[PDB]
Amino acid sequence: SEEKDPDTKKDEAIEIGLKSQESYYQRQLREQLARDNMTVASR
Amino acid sequence: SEEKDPDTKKDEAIEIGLKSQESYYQRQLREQLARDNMTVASR
Amino acid sequence: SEEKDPDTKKDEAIEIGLKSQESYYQRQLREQLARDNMTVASR
Amino acid sequence: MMPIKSIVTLDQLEDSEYLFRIVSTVLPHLCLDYKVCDQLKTTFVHPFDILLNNSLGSVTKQDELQAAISKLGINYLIDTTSRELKLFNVTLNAGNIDIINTPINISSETNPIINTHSFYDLPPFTQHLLNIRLTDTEYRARFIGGYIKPDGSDSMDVLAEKKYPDLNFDNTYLFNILYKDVINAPIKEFKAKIVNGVLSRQDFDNLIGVRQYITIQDRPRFDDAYNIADAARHYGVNLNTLPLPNVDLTTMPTYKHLIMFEQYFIYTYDRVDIYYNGNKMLFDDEIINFTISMRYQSLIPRLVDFFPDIPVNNNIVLHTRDPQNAAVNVTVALPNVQFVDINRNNKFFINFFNLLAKEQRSTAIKVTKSMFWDGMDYEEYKSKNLQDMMFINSTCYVFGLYNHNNTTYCSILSDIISAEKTPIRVCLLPRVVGGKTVTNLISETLKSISSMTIREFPRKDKSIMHIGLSETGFMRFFQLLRLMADKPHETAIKEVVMAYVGIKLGDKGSPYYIRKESYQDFIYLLFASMGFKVTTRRSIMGSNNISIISIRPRVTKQYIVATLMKTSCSKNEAEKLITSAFDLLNFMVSVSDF
Amino acid sequence: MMPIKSIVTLDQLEDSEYLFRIVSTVLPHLCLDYKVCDQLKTTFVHPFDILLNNSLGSVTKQDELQAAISKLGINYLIDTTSRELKLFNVTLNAGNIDIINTPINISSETNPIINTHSFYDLPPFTQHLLNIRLTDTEYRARFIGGYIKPDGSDSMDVLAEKKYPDLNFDNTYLFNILYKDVINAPIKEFKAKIVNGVLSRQDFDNLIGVRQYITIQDRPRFDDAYNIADAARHYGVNLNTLPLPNVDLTTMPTYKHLIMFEQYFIYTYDRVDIYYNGNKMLFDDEIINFTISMRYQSLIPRLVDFFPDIPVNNNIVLHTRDPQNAAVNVTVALPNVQFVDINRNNKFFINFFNLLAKEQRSTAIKVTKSMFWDGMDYEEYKSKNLQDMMFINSTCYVFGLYNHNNTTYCSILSDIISAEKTPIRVCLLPRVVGGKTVTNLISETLKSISSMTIREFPRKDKSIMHIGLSETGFMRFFQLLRLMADKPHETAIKEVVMAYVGIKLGDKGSPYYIRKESYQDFIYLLFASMGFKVTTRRSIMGSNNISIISIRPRVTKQYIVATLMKTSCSKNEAEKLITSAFDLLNFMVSVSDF
Amino acid sequence: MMPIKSIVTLDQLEDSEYLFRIVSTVLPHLCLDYKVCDQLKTTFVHPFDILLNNSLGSVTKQDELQAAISKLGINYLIDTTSRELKLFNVTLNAGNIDIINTPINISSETNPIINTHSFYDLPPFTQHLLNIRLTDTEYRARFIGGYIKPDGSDSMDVLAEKKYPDLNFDNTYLFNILYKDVINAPIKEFKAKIVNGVLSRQDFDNLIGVRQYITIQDRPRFDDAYNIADAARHYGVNLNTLPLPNVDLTTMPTYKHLIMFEQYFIYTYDRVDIYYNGNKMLFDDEIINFTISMRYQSLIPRLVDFFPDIPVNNNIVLHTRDPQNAAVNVTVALPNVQFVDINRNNKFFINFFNLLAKEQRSTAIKVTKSMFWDGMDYEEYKSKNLQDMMFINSTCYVFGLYNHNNTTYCSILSDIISAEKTPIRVCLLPRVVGGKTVTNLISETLKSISSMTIREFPRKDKSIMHIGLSETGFMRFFQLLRLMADKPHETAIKEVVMAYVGIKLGDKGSPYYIRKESYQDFIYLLFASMGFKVTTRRSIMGSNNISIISIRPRVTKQYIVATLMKTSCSKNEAEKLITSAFDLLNFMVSVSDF
């Protein structure tokens, strides 16, 4: 029963945290790639 | 044993009746289609 | 265990004998085909 | 203080030892005048057990058996063609039946009372049915066991959430399915019979019809799969001079063969093109809806009786192309014709029309109330006397029907009562030994002894080397003596006397001569089992180790007669027991001073 | 000289007769002050039995049960995704569990002690677990039965050659898996839930995410397999106005949906192309290693704790093509990022990361020592008194743990001892009847009788037509009287008295009025079972066949009190038995001169 | 009047309680001079049970076992390659055997006598064999159980409608098949062994030969499936410097590798073209008929002995093409060569030639008459004495062979007799406990007691805290005392005395010191079980609840000696029982006034 699995709310909190970490690493990635793109566009 | 299934004779009587009904409806069909073909050949 | 299957030595003796018979028949075969090849090369 | 599970229920031994408690723990408390209920003198056995082994039919009621055969035949065809969950878990092949080793599904609908019996004394399909009946819904059990509801208000309908249709007519389906000699074709859906090594005439003519509708490319693989060439040669039929089929639905003389192609062969061979009045048909769904409606027009209302929601229309739409390749929708609307849509389960509905068509040309089957299936009301059971309840619980398996979560279940009666459920009905299955119901064995035994005119008590004789039983009687009796122990002397006498008589009543053979070597040990076992104090004095006289057997109390007419009169309902009974056990009593009296 | 296998162990009957030996072969040797061990008042039942039938939870310890549910949930996911040999032999479906009919593998690792018990009295998964526990390694048994090692040094680790990881956190996996209403899609790997006839919101949003990564060609077959169109319409979602997915791994906002595609859908649908910073990716092995490492970066050390040998690197190499179709190897090395290679078993490692991620956001489960799993030390067992050993071996199944070939096995304790193996521990399972542990039934019975203030012994009354038991009490009692026989009179009295009281203690119903027809036979059975000499004089007076019942020795306050005092640990006990059995004793005294 | 199925046959308990009836219901009626039959001192156990667990071999006759191992090996190869219905229902894998969960086929050929035994005390393949033997034809049972017909006219041939060939020679097939370390290739037909982590030399050389005949396209998939590259590197073999195969059948030096390709590999890899004298071969059927005939020319007559109908010719026709692509039929006719056609079951006939070729280079196996398989004639059985029949029916499973519908069947002997069938022979299987046949245990026990010089009867001593048994002896004995009840005092004494001695004879350990806490309860159980009137006076003296144990009749040398002399065949026997039970009698006499 969708209403009455308490884990639905734990799991939302779990996904939010995973996507948050994932978004952070995706930003570190895009920042590294931005630094590298700018330096390649000048080397 | 082919000779000693009494149902072989019931089943023949059953098929004869089904094919008889089927032949009747096939004739009603061909009669309707004949009436329709003749009227289409004049409309 | 490869070292301690006594049948490995029986089986070697078996293969040797089978290949020996096989080699004999293969020779009878090639001898018959040699006789036939020489006669065809002259007929 | 002994362990618990040691009082085996009336239900977990072998046959010989399951005769012993009947002979020692039912028969000595029955008076000779006790009437066994007649319904209990036959028992249920599953039709499959009997079709494979006709001898098992002997303990059954013939009219219930023939009915069950025809009924199972119908139920199986329904279930087998159903897309719903199979209620059967066996496969009927040519000549044999496979019990399928299905996964044990366990769900909210499993009988919430666990079954603690294994039923290893019953024939395998009978045993299998009981396992299902006790673990599943009563509805499933009745369906697979070929139950027919008897005429009368006292038949009980069982709660179940879903049910198949309930057709009932005489038929030979099981004999046709179980026919041993069939072509082992890659398509198993058509069981082409072999008669005298050649494909049957009926099947040959059928397949010849179907062949007309197969493509030129696939005909070789078809002809090979059914050995048509040999059959044609044997039946004189020149395949090359068969006519082209009339592929136009309007002038086609019978749809029978086209329907058979659709039913058994479409999924393996390519068909020729089908036409309506010169236009090519675009959908096989439309072809099958048209042909079935035309062939079975008279049964459509009767189909609607089981399937109200099934679409029935006064017209049908056929999507076609003209020869000029233009899409033409033909709406067919014939006077007094109706069209049914069967697409969502064509194979089932085609087979269902065949069942209906046969039913319309067969008689319905009537049956009496079954003590196995319908049983008795729980109040009627509780109204019985204490001896009847002892007899039932000592000669039959005893079951109850009960309701839970809007479903009827069956379980052993004790376990329903223990689970604090209320039984609605009590259902019985008389147990069987030596090809008879035990109930009937008892009935016959009591009658036979009762019928004996009383003879004189035997006089002491010399050199009696037999107890009148044959070899096979003597050996059964001897096994039973090894099981007779520690009982009160007077009762032990009556029990051994009744054991002898129960065997003697089936004992066709000439008397068996006890071997000299065995003779003293037999004397010992017989008197010890009866609870006489046997005393074996070994005296060494010279080199010889003489054994003298002394039995106390002394075997005398007064001692035996008095001992049996205590344990008998009347003096007449005691004298009729003495009369039936004459040879044994002649032996005993003749060896008592040995 | 009777046959051997006739002393059935405490373990092969049905329930009613397994109550009889408790009542006749444990309870009359216990003094009313005997304390049953509290650990034995609950018993183990397998979580599957209880999830399908919650009533079976009643005899279990709740805190061990909830723990086992969550633990099994984890173990099953590990095993199911493992490429190694499955330790489970059941399939959890929607609404039901299938026991799989696996081939009986027999090897050098099979328990060298054969199991001689069938356990047909236990719920089917409980029974199934025991069969495995006794034939296989103890490691397998603990894993499938959802064992959690309790806190403390006295929990024994079991020798086994290979083991799965041991995660432990609260979860609802089993309730989700066993959810009855799911789309029956051809791909069973994704159990899309149906709520109010429509695919669930959580699943719909998930599938909508996944759909973005499916090709234009395959989207129709996907949308059909999960009925996405209806779900979209119901959820207001216009599929046509969904955005194009960001297929570049660098700017993709979540890898969640791409990972789900790889986990459940790659093996059935074609994917769109995936890019890294404008370059097309060449290998899915690289895509799955990148996305998982980025999504679960924080758990990589914790994975290495279970799998030390798993490759973890400070960089990854992605083989790509530029838009100009030149092969470009991109080496990605982000500050404070590590990359794990999961190629061996992607499906397992993806699921393992999910378990770890949930564990990091769940509490760990704590449990007490289980008498079923952990048992007691063999020395501790041998230190017990003779009555405790009789009670245990008469109310519980009794198992031992032993080592052979560097593996721990479990077998019945007698069989370990008989195979000259040394038990390390003794494990117990209290047997159950009528929804209670038998141990607890005894505990309650003893307590109740002990608590009774002593009443006067009943005085002789007229026309007592009941023994105070209800219908269901009376019928259980009557069955038990048919089993009571041949015992010493004094003991037979105490056993029948204790039987009555044990039933009376659960007997909610108004007294049952013995039918007049049954009344004499009941009198006979009751006094005969108690070992009184019942004498039934049939005297023909005129046309009437009068039966007079004479019982010896005479039922009197002194006779009963004296007889019970011999068989009781104290006079107080005898008087408390008399007090608890008052109605029965009132009946007896009132019919003794009948 | 208790229920029926309660005298459990000699066949449905566990081990300890199946020792109890031997000790209480065989041993006290045997005189110390009774000779157990020597054939009964070993028992049959199925070779599979022993190959996996060598300890089970201990109760078997070694010469029957080695024979059965070699015989099963042959029978399995025949059956496995047969296209006919498999007589085996197990799969022999590397390191393990799977019992296959085959559907229960039920037919007109099923044994018409139902089997009412479960045999849960027997090793799993032994148990499995018995189930088959009792439900199926005796022919099937003998074939799967590796029966060899013994030398002599008294070996009975069994009626069956069809039979496999009967080859008999020593071999190691089962040890090779069950070898644990093999490459898990997708083709299971070739079990390539791994030795020291690398494919075996014999298999490597074989596969290298086969590889030559695989196409350039398929060689990679082959080399990968068997890890040929590593094996080649390990064996120093440069694959690149292997020669081209001689693909011409005329100058090919051995057909061995081409035949192996056809036997194990054709169904998975493409072959190179094969030539005859320069012409390409058109049919693999012709290639396999030629190569086999040439390789096994000497065995063709011996094949015809089993298969008379098999086509053998003095020539063969090979359909070929010349290099100019013209069809040329070559008729090959070589001096003193014959050609056999094996096409309709090539895989079987190739394997059958290998069996014949090995038989021609192995010795035949000779065996003695098996009491399990051949048994004794039914008349010979019936000629035996009453004690022998009691001993047999109390230490062995007892079977009979009987004929019905021109087929021989086996069933339990009672059930043949009950079904009014006539047994032809009686077959026996001595039951096993603690790794010995029970028959032999009895033989040893009787011998040991008989051999004892008589000692003095023990004198009354102080503070005896042991009965001389070890811990494991004492605990087995204590279990047995809990099973000793209600028996006549004189007999109960002899039975308990014989129980002690039977344990004492296997009791390796130092005496067990009865714990002070247990000591009174042990005294009670021991004298109560022996049927002494134990009287426990509880007297409250001050605050202390003193228990005094009084045993009647008094334990004295005269009482015991007199009591045992009544129950013993001679005075000498009574004194030898006293001598063997010395420690126990010393205990008893020392506690009788306690």
> What DSSP letter does each residue of F137-184 carry, written as one string?
BHHHHHHHTT--PPSSTTPPPPP-S-----------HHHHHT-S-B--
Crossing angle of helices F438-451 and F489-504, in 10° steps, is 100
Query: Between chain B and chain D, how many beta carbons pairs sit less than 8 Å apart?
Result: 62
Contacts of D422 by beta carbon, 8 Å cutoff, 6+ apart: D378, D402, D416
What Rg do the C-alpha atoms of chain C give, in angstroms? Answer: 18
CA distance F249 to E525: 93
Neighbours of chain D (3+ CB pairs under 8 A): B, E, F
> What six digits make up the tokens of D355?
């069942």
Report the gap between the CA of D388 and the closest CA in chain F (Å): 14
**Which of F422, F367, F381, F352 is CA-nearest to residue F145?**
F367
Place of tokens 């390390």: E424
Residues shown for chain A? 43
Nearest to D148 by CA among D76, D59, D65, D81: D65
> Is F314 in contact with F264 (CB distance < 8 Å)?
no
Closest CA to F573 of F24, F37, F28: F28
Report the alpha-carbon distance of residue E446 to residue E26 in Å, rounded: 12
DSSP β-bridge partners for residue E411 = E400
Contact (CB<8Å) E332/A2: no
Take residue F468 and report the two structure tokens written for it. 């001389």
Residue from the list F106, F414, F485 with its beta carbon closest to the beta carbon of D14? F414
Q: Are F129 and F144 in contact (CB under 8 A)?
A: yes
Q: Do F103 and D125 touch (CB under 8 A)?
A: no
- Residues of E near F (Cβ–Cβ under 8 Å) read 1-9, 12, 101-108, 110, 112, 114-118, 383, 385-387, 390, 393, 412, 414-415, 417-420, 482-483, 485-487, 569
Beta bridge partners of E303: none
Q: Tell me, yes or no, whether chains F and B touch by having 3 or more C-beta pairs under 8 A.
A: no
Beta bridge partner(s), residue E318:
E330
Contact check, Cβ <8 Å, D6/E21: yes
**Which chains form contacts with chain E, at 3 or more CB pairs under 8 Å?**
A, D, F
Instruction: Considering only the beta carbons, identify the residue of C5, C17, C22 that sits closest to F294.
Output: C22
Question: First vs last Cα of chain C: how many Å apart?
Answer: 60
Identify whether the C-beta of residue F320 lies closer than 8 Å to the C-beta of residue F282. yes
Query: Mapped to the 3 state alphabet, what secondary structure does E190-227 carry?
Result: CCCEEECCEECHHHHHHHHHHHCCECCCCHHHHHHHCC
Find out whether the peptide bond into D553 is cis, omega within 30 degrees of 0: yes
β-strand pairing of E432-433 with F96-99: unpaired
Let me know how many helices (H) and strands (E) chain F has, helices first: 23, 19
Question: If 0-12 CB within 10 Å is exposed, 13-18 middle and 19+ buried, where does residue D543 land?
Answer: exposed
Please choose, from the candidates F207, F226, F190, F174, the residue with its C-alpha nearest in 3D space to the C-alpha of residue F65.
Answer: F174
CA distance E176 to A1: 9
Q: Parallel, antiparallel, or unpaired: how do β-strands F327-332 and F316-321 relate?
A: antiparallel
* C-interface mutation test, from F191, F250, F293, F340, most C Cβ less than 10 A away: F250
Beta carbons within 8 Å of D143's beta carbon, 6+ residues apart: D75, D79, D87, D164
ω into F186 cis (within 30 of 0) = no
Residue D112 DSSP code: S
Q: Are E496 and E39 in contact (CB under 8 A)?
A: no
Residue in F5, F14, F537 to test binding to E, most E beta-carbons within 10 Å? F14
E536 in contact with chain A, both atoms CB, cutoff 8 A:
no
- Expressed in angstroms, the distance from the first to the final Cα of chain E is 41
Distance CA F60, CA F43 (A): 5
Sequence-ordered alpha helix ranges (H) in D235-313: 256-264, 284-295, 300-306
- Closest CA–CA distance from residue B14 to any residue of chain D (Å): 7
Nearest to D132 by CA among D146, D115, D107: D115
Helix (H) or strand (E) segment spanning residue E17: helix E17-25
d(C-alpha F78, C-alpha F42), whole Å: 30
**According to the entry, how was the structure determined?**
cryo-EM
| Interchain contact, F295 vs C8, CB within 8 Å | no
> Whole-angstrom Cα distance, residue F101 to residue F97?
13
Chains F and C touch (3+ CB pairs under 8 A): yes
Task: Tell me the residue type at D60.
Answer: T
- A15 to E256: CB separation less than 8 angstroms, yes or no: yes
- Stretch (H or E) spanning F209: helix F201-211
Residue environment code for F145-183, b if the CB has 16+ CB neighbours within 10 A, otherwise e: bbbbbbeeeeeeebebeeeeeebbbbbbbbeebbbeebb
Instruction: Using only the alpha carbons of chain A, give its radius of gyration.
Output: 18
Return the closest-CA partner of residue E442 out of E30, E91, E14, E8: E30
Residues in chain D: 594
Question: Hey, what are D517's tokens?
Answer: 């070597």
Helix (H, G, I), strand (E, B) or coil at D423: coil
Query: What is the C-alpha separation between F327 and F281, in angstroms, rounded?
Result: 10
The candidate with the shortest Cα–Cα distance to D373, out of D439, D438, D432, D426, is D426
| Under 8 Å between Cβ of D191 and D182 | yes
Cα of B39 to nearest chain D Cα, Å:
15
User: Which of D138, D86, D129 is CA-nearest to residue D111?
Assistant: D138
| Residue D133 host element (H or E) | helix D124-135
Residue E51's H or E segment, with its range, is helix E47-52
All residues at 6 or more sequence positions from D268 whose CB lies less than 8 Å from its CB, including other chains: D186, D187
How do the residues of chain F divide into helix, strand and coil, expressed in percent and rounded to 5? 40, 15, 45
Tokens of F455: 């000692």
Cβ within 8 Å, pair F1-E112 = no
Contact F415 D14 (CB under 8 A): yes
Closest residue by Cα to residue D113 from D406, D420, D378, D424? D420
Residues F369 and F155 sit within 8 Å (Cβ to Cβ): yes
Burial class (CB in 10 A: 0-12, 13-18, 19+), F504: buried
Q: Using the Cα atoms of residue F246, residue F249, residue F254 and residue F256 in order, give the sign of their dihedral.
A: positive
Instruction: Say which residues have a Cβ less than 8 Å from residue D69's Cβ, sequence separation at least 6.
Output: D47, D51, D146, D174
Cβ distance D246 to D252 under 8 Å? Answer: yes
What's the distance, CA F470 to chain centroid? 33
- A 10 A CB-CB count for B31 gives 12
Evaluated on CA atoms F161, F165, F169, F175, the torsion sign reads negative
Residues 6+ apart with CB under 8 A from D54: none
Is the Cβ pair B23, D335 closer than 8 Å?
no
**E14, D415 Cβ separation under 8 angstroms:** yes
Write D234-239 long-range contacts (CB < 8 A, 24+): D234/D198, D235/D201, D235/D204, D237/D204, D237/D208
Instruction: Enter the resolution in angstroms.
Output: 9.7
In angstroms, the CA F427 to CA F516 distance is 51
Type and span of the H or E element at E404: strand E396-404
d(CA F387, CA D505): 28
Cβ pair B18:D252 closer than 8 A: no
Q: Which residue of D277, D337, D361 is in closest CB contact with B25?
A: D337
Identify the closest residue of chain D to F417 by CA–CA distance.
D472
Q: Which of E265, E134, E257 is closest to E190 using CA atoms? A: E265
The Cα–Cα gap between E417 and F479 comes to 11
Whether chain B lies against chain E with 3 or more Cβ pairs closer than 8 A is no
Residue length, chain C? 43
Cβ neighbours of residue F163 closer than 8 Å, sequence gap 6 or more = F139
Count of alpha carbons within 13 angstroms of residue E91, beta-carbon side: 11
The pair of structure tokens assigned to D487 is: 């009982």
Distance between CA atoms of residues E362 and F372, nearest Å: 62
Q: Which residue has the tokens 């072959």?
A: F271
SS3 state at D508: coil
Helix, strand, coil share of chain D (percent; to 5): 45, 15, 45
Q: Which amino acid is at E378?
A: Y
Query: Is the minimum CB–CB distance between E149 and chain A shorter than 8 Å?
Result: no
Question: With contact defined as beta carbons under 8 Å apart, do F129 and F141 qualify?
Answer: yes
CB contact under 8 A, D2 and F485: yes
The CA distances from residue F525 to E9, E33, E201, F520, in Å, are 19, 21, 70, 9
Q: Assess F246–C contact: CB distance below 8 Å, yes or no.
A: no
With contact defined as 3+ CB pairs under 8 Å, the chains touching B are D
In terms of Cα–Cα distance, which of D197, D193, D196, D228 is closest to D210?
Answer: D228
**Contact by Cβ (8 Å): D150, D50:** no
* E224, E212 Cβ separation under 8 angstroms: no
CB E215 within 8 A of CB E222: no
Q: Does the distance separating the beta carbons of B2 and D193 come in below 8 Å?
A: yes
Q: Whole-angstrom Cα distance, residue F68 to residue E340?
A: 54
Q: Cα separations (Å) of F372 from D552, F262, F399?
A: 43, 42, 9
Tell me which residue in F171, F200, F277 faces C33 most closely, judged by beta carbons. Answer: F277
Tell if the CB–CB gap between A25 and E297 is shorter than 8 Å: yes
Contact call for E25 and D5, based on CB within 8 A:
no
